[PDB]
Ligand binder design. Sequence first.
Ligand code: HEM
Length: 397
Amino acid sequence: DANTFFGAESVQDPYPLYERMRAAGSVHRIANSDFYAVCGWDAVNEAIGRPEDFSSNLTATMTYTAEGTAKPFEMDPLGGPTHVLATADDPAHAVHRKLVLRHLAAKRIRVMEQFTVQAADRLWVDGMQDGCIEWMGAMANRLPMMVVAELIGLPDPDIAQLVKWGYAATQLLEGLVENDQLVAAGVALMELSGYIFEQFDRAAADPRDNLLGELATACASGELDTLTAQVMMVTLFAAGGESTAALLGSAVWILATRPDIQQQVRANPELLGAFIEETLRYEPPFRGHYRHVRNATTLDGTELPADSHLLLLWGAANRDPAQFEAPGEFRLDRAKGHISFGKGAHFCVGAALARLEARIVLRLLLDRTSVIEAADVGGWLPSILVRRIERLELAVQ
Ligand code: HEM
């Protein structure tokens, strides 16, 4: 594959790849695999609007052999009970989404704001020494994991552990990182799982006003199964922790490497919300999400066999030249949006929270500095699904 989704180049910068795929059409088979890249804006919107045809159950991911050949990493079949929340179809999906939304209501977000302000300040104090901070390990990796742990109700977490735990599932699900990294991720996910099961067993005996308690209560009344509830909580670390970490990393990487953009936001602090939205458009934390194709059908004109899969490429949709002027240019004056939080039945429940974490953290960084520059920029996580920088050493004044 001239158009492979893995390899050093695609990991570093996948956007030219998406434009090549788009030449073949808005939907296009990946090599000779059973996966079809969805790069068109209208095609992604159509797909997400057809949950009956394109299930969210994660029945397979795309992986690559050592020989570089795409192949399916098969998981739980269509309709299975392992599919929860973001990967569940209705009716279970709507129950799951309702329960989690209770912990993301307006009042909940206000509490989170106070929590985030205090946590961000402590992280900055600990991490910024002699005009230097490694942004990923000190801030971007930690803060969003602490927020997910607080939403769930975990007591006074070991932050070092949380980061490991929170990044484990992506690595395991793709099987793209090296074997030693995969073994460590498996240990990490075992540890995370076991910790959640321990905390849930304790919540069931005395439910408190957090998602653990909400779930313990809903299980007691028969609304869902105990194991389903525990798995739901496990998945929130990748869903809400890793994704937000990625945004915090990319936003800063852009500030640090585009002085013109950084001066614009400094000079006109009212452009911070636009800058966050443009980062979401231009470097979405998720490269994509899968769907399972239930029956032979068509999407935006393109044929799809039964039991194939879609890869919904949010980043590629956000650069569709039918929808956006100057799609490849980072601009602070746009007034269409983006599809980086999805749309429709599974539209991100955490979007307000994510946007709040970005606003708090980025305003702290900008308010406390006069100039930020990149001293050393690491590589990106080897992934087909997630767009996360691994290391970003800043020099500040
Ligand atoms: C920048 C940060 C974030 C991005 C880019 C992001 C993106 C997404 C996307 C694209 C979807 C739809 C997936 C699909 O259609 O298959 C989604 C769903 C979801 N997001 Fe996020 N998200 C972020 C932050 C968060 C946070 C902070 C939380 C929770 C604390 C969260 C929880 C979820 C959940 C539970 C769903 C599934 C909703 C449902 O199935 O009804 N997200 N998110």
